[PDB]
Amino acid sequence: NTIEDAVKLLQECKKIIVLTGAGVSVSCGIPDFRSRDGIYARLAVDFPDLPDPQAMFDIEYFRKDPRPFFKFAKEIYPGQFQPSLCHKFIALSDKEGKLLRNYTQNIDTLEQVAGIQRIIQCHGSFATASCLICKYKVDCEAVRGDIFNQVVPRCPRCPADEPLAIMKPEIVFFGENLPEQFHRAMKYDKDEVDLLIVIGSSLKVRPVALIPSSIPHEVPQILINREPLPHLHFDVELLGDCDVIINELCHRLGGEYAKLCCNPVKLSEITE
């Protein structure tokens, strides 16, 4: 349960699964969900008319009133931020052939900018949109204009008389099923994985939260996070800023990893 043990594991293991959440994008300028400076805290101020902050990405509320989501969607739309050190570390692991899979809970699509190939977007993305009623699929470009104008995009197939004929981006809301590729990948990966690393996630959301216990118990597990996850037992817990920790791991690993080293907590201001 030391940083030296994490390095030893990183040097020895060849089929690594990295599970990431909103914590890895905090340094990029994207807030997480549940921290004091998270999405929920910001939603409580900026969208006080919601029953609760969780309603913004809840399928039941979206069906009732989709206007708040399309007021907010442009704020979380991909293509405006740069990848963190963590993204680059995962990308290098992939190039080095050591990465089995990066399961990401983020929709920011920074993995694509960083160059991570072996990637699963567990909670979907803005790349496609789907009608609530008829399940008609479009690519993002068909609905991009409506999103940036804060307008509710309507289904071309369904009649104008149907109120729920709304083109919803295929990001996974509460109450929705995850993309099939997630279940497909886990079915194969669980028998191949030789190391599991969780970075920047509270693991409070099913079924992704079930991954750490769905793989063989004998597989070593590392946590890189600001806080411990009380419900889960890890073999190594590296507690603190994930970029600081990864930067320290990169120094100790050397070679190509040491080339990623930088100053992740130098004095800086993030602008709006």
Ligand SMILES: NC(=O)c1ccc[n+]([C@@H]2O[C@H](COP(=O)([O-])OP(=O)(O)OC[C@H]3O[C@@H](n4cnc5c(N)ncnc54)[C@H](O)[C@@H]3O)[C@@H](O)[C@H]2O)c1
């Ligand atoms: N209606 C809703 O509210 C709703 C709907 C759909 C999905 N969700 C989901 O909630 C899911 C789970 O959230 P999550 O785990 O990704 O985020 P989270 O906010 O729950 O947890 C982020 C974790 O990372 C840590 N962290 C933050 N910054 C860090 C840093 N710089 N270094 C190290 N650690 C850091 C935090 O302490 C926290 O433990 C999201 O993927 C989202 O899909 C919520």
Ligand SMILES: NC(=O)[C@H]1CCCCc2c1[nH]c1ccc(Cl)cc21
């Ligand atoms: N960095 C991400 O992309 C995170 C954190 C920023 C808010 C949007 C968001 C994220 N993850 C999600 C998963 C599902 C939904 Cl509906 C929305 C989100």
Ligand SMILES: [Zn+2]
């Ligand atoms: Zn339709």
